[PDB]
Each structure stands twice: as structure tokens, then as C-alpha cells.
């Protein structure tokens, strides 16, 4: 499945090089600009536990998910991963617990020590 493919082919985009956040570009975006810390970022995404027990999508409200990059308003993996993306890009992320919800988890939605997978489309980003 797509998570296994990221294990097998994904680039490690962590600074520590601990394979905590692995990425595959699934559709190339446009231009050279990737977002900076503080930019307002608009995405669609589909997310699940690596297990496959819970599944979440922005496409539920067919409404983009919006956040300010690099302010830790989302899990660290997203701050790291969305920062690497170009407008119009779609990417897969596979995420070790240290860059998501850790040993504590976020019960009852996210168990302890959970690995997460996401497909993310970067729709737009704009300066604050
Ligand atoms: C931990 O709580 C939540 C986590 C998520 C999902 C999630 O982990 N995220 C949602 C999209 C941004 C990345 C990441 C996250 O930071 O979510 C919590 C945040 S932080 C700002 N808004 C949200 Cl929602 C889970 C992904 C895997 C399968 C279950 C959901 C959506 C949630 O609700 C839509 C949510 O409740 C707030």
C-alpha cells in the first residue's frame, strides 16, 4: 500500500535524519517557491493511522484545511513536510510517533506510539 511505498521509496526530510518524517512527491507542483514560517497555508488532505483503524479527510467538508506554517499549530511532521512542498504539489507523508502524537497519544482518537500516514495537496500559501 501507499504507506509501505513511502517506507521503501520515501525521502527522509528530518534534520536529525531519523526517518521520523518520510516523503514521496506524488504530483509535482509549480514554480520554485515553498512556504516560509508564518505563511498562511491551504491544503486538502486525507489521513489515517498506519494500521488503518481511523481515517480523516478535509474533503469531508470539501473545505480546505488552513493553518499558519511552522508555529506548531499542527503536528511537527506537518510543519516539516508542508514546508518542503510547492503550490499544486501532492505528497505522501509517513510519520513516526515522535513527530506526531508521541508516547502520550491523543486518546481516544490517536493511540500511544502511533504511526500516521497522510496524502497532502498544497493548494496555496500566502504571506501573513
Ligand atoms: C488529534 O486530534 C485530531 C487529529 C486529526 C488528524 C491529524 O492528526 N491531523 C489533522 C490535520 C493536520 C495534521 C494533524 C494534526 O495536527 O491534527 C490536530 C490539529 S492541530 C490543528 N487542527 C487540528 Cl485538527 C488525525 C490523522 C490520522 C487519523 C485520525 C486523525 C484530525 C482531528 O480532527 C479533525 C483531530 O481532532 C482535532
SS3 53: coil
Given 65, 99, 101, 125, the catalytic residue = 101
Residue nearest to atom 12 of ligand 1 (CA): 74
**Can you give the resolution of this entry in Å?**
1.8
Our answer on whether the CB atom of 116 is closer than 6 Å to any ligand 1 atom is: yes
Query: What does the CA dihedral 90, 93, 99, 104 come to, rounded to 10 degrees?
Result: 110
The three-state secondary structure class of 126 is: strand
Burial class from Cβ neighbours inside 10 Å (0-12, 13-18, 19+) for residue 121 reads: buried
For ligand 1, atom 22, which residue shows the shortest CA distance?
Answer: 74
Q: Which residue's alpha carbon is at the smallest distance from atom 37 of ligand 1?
A: 109
Q: Write down the experimental method used for this entry.
A: X-ray
**Cα distances (Å, whole numbers) of residue 112 to 97, 101, 105, 120:** 8, 7, 4, 23
Give CA angle at 98 (4, 124), nearest 5°.
70
Cβ–ligand 1 contact at 48 (below 6 Å): yes
Amino acid at each position: 500500500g501507499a504507506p509501505a511505498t513511502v517506507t521503501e521509496q520515501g525521502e527522509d526530510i528530518t534534520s536529525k535524519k531519523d526517518r521520523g518524517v518520510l516523503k514521496i512527491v506524488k504530483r509535482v507542483g509549480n514554480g520554485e517557491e515553498t512556504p516560509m514560517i508564518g505563511d498562511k497555508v491551504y491544503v486538502h488532505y486525507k489521513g489515517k493511522l498506519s494500521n488503518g483503524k481511523k481515517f480523516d479527510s478535509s474533503h469531508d467538508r470539501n473545505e480546505p484545511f488552513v493553518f499558519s506554517l511552522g508555529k506548531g499549530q499542527v503536528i511537527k511532521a506537518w510543519d516539516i513536510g508542508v514546508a518542503t512542498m510547492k503550490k499544486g504539489e501532492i505528497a505522501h507523508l509517513l510519520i513516526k510517533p515522535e513527530y506526531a502524537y508521541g508516547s502520550a497519544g491523543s486518546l481516544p482518537k490517536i493511540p500511544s506510539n502511533a504511526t500516521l500516514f497522510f496524502e497532502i495537496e498544497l493548494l496555496d500559501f500566502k504571506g501573513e
